[PDB]
């Protein structure tokens, strides 16, 4: 239902998406604080 | 059809083919276990056993 | 979840080492984000673009604004700080992330993850199967439902063995991941320790900004540089531990060669010989689970045991059968003997041993069972029939059958299908054998133990033999009856048939004799004889049958006999005769000299008349002349008032003489196929006439009076 629809490339894209979300949020935080 | 000798499960439409390809990429055996209930000869076997 | 057991001890240790490394890297990163600064102060005496370092002391006044201090601090931090010193925590975080990705590589990859989840589920259920612990305890009565559960477990085990034993995929992926982890540890442990020295508390930067400041060289302080050195040492110590663990893993894997599971110690200890060594993608996982827990291996081994599977199937076989179904399955043969014929049945359900009323047991296509002692409970068994089974026996079973067996019948395609302990049964009296036992240069040698069967009396042979067996001839001293069915093969007596003088009956059907050897006449105790399908054309030798004073019956039917030799008139001792399926055309008067004749079957012949001497044969009671040229009936036919039943159908008989009423004992009559027009009224006055005993067409029967029909139907209902 939530796991069987995901091929390997789907998992890798999801991981890259999570990493990009972390990158964007961290960049926003750094711009807020120290920029 | 070659293995179980059941000439049924002839083909599918576009949507069923799409879903079946995605299942095969996820796992090559779940499609084999899923197509049994589409088999006509298997359905005959189940009907005969139940009867 | 349940994947805890998959991880080796070193896997958990790597997990926690990575956890610690990620924690310290995150702490270092968040500290560098906020509290990381550098404090810079210029140098006034600048020689060679460097700090020359040339009444209370007074403060040195650089006359610089705090904003200028901030600008120079930022510029010096950017230009003249080691990049590794600026990005150690982010690099460590990236390395932890890639380590985690490599660790969950095979785990987050669905291709192998499907195999892993199936394997862990099957291993879990095989460890916890109720039947596995029972089988281990065997070193019983079971539920049918648990039998189905264990049976489906065996089916899934076979399916999974077919599916994954071939693969060898997860092994390759884990090997690649281990290689990546080891080499990455080596790379980081190399370059990090190469560049560790660059993190120093004090730095000297000459960014050459004089249009804004006037100064050239600056000495600066990085407070966390000692702290970052501590973090680097701690992290690289963690890296050393991770690399030691990874090298241990890879070396153990290379030394192990776990593509085939040895599997011989467990089966050797438990004597479960059916525990074969499994191939790659099954041995590797088995070894990993053994690393977690060796016992889990054995808890699965018993379900790869074919002996265990067969035992479970036998338990299910015993569960299925109910004594009532065998009771309804008990039948009565033509010998009034209770029969339970087990056919194409996998094994013995011991419940069949409770019905002592079983008189005859017939076994066919039953795979090589062994008789348990409980057969001793079957008192009534006297005759046995085994068809194509190389069955074994137990000593109590052999002892019970040694005195509780009377007849035995075997139908075998191959010699080995005969158990060899047959010669130990001393109460055997009738033995029947079917199938080609013929061998070359050792024929009649496998059956040499018949001499041990002292009480053997009857013997039936269906083996297409061409020579009389020597052991059979020797054992014929106490045989009273011998039957041979060579079914096509011509047999030579070799004069060895006369040594069984005690013989009383002799049957040679389809033996293609084509002639009567003299030795047959030597059997003084012989009374009946059948020589069907021996292609007999001339039977004038019957004159020597004067030798047999107890010559009661004779059969030479299904032959070429077209004429009757008169010497049978000497054979007055005959009481029955059957020479049908021949080409006999006339009945000599001399045949009527055997007045003791009681039964005849001369059907399927060229006969066209009945001689008036039938009144001579007053002892006759049954005669068949079907498929002949009979169109006339003598009055003397009706002179035998004790004639019970007749088979006279399918002839050219125009009319039935009215003297049929003289047949007072006439019970059954066949007239179907006769060219009759009116049934005689005196046929309807016979006391023993019944519609069942009246085989005649309805149209010709309708010529009878209606009262005759009514009485016939009334006797049919009564």
Coordinates of N, CA and C in Angstrom, one line a residue, chain B residues 25-44:
Chain B
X25 N 9.1 -5.2 -11.3 CA 10.3 -4.4 -10.9 C 10.5 -4.5 -9.4
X26 N 9.4 -4.3 -8.7 CA 9.4 -4.5 -7.2 C 9.7 -5.9 -6.8
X27 N 9.1 -6.9 -7.4 CA 9.4 -8.3 -7.1 C 8.9 -9.2 -8.3
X28 N 9.7 -10.1 -8.8 CA 9.3 -10.9 -9.9 C 8.4 -12.0 -9.6
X29 N 8.1 -12.3 -8.3 CA 7.3 -13.5 -8.0 C 5.9 -13.1 -7.5
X30 N 5.7 -11.9 -7.1 CA 4.3 -11.5 -6.7 C 3.4 -11.5 -7.9
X31 N 3.9 -11.2 -9.1 CA 3.1 -11.2 -10.3 C 2.7 -12.7 -10.6
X32 N 3.6 -13.6 -10.4 CA 3.3 -15.0 -10.6 C 2.2 -15.5 -9.6
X33 N 2.4 -15.1 -8.3 CA 1.4 -15.5 -7.4 C 0.0 -14.7 -7.6
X34 N 0.1 -13.6 -8.2 CA -1.2 -12.8 -8.4 C -1.9 -13.3 -9.6
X35 N -1.3 -13.7 -10.7 CA -1.9 -14.1 -11.9 C -2.8 -15.3 -11.8
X36 N -2.6 -16.1 -10.8 CA -3.3 -17.4 -10.6 C -4.8 -17.2 -10.6
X37 N -5.3 -16.2 -9.9 CA -6.7 -15.9 -9.8 C -7.3 -15.3 -11.1
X38 N -6.4 -15.0 -12.1 CA -6.9 -14.6 -13.4 C -7.0 -15.8 -14.3
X39 N -6.2 -16.9 -14.0 CA -6.2 -18.1 -14.8 C -7.6 -18.7 -14.9
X40 N -8.0 -19.0 -16.2 CA -9.3 -19.7 -16.4 C -9.2 -21.2 -16.0
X41 N -8.1 -21.9 -16.3 CA -8.0 -23.3 -16.0 C -7.9 -23.5 -14.5
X42 N -7.1 -22.6 -13.8 CA -7.1 -22.7 -12.4 C -8.4 -22.4 -11.8
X43 N -9.2 -21.5 -12.3 CA -10.6 -21.3 -11.9 C -11.4 -22.5 -12.0
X44 N -11.2 -23.2 -13.2 CA -11.9 -24.5 -13.4 C -11.5 -25.5 -12.3

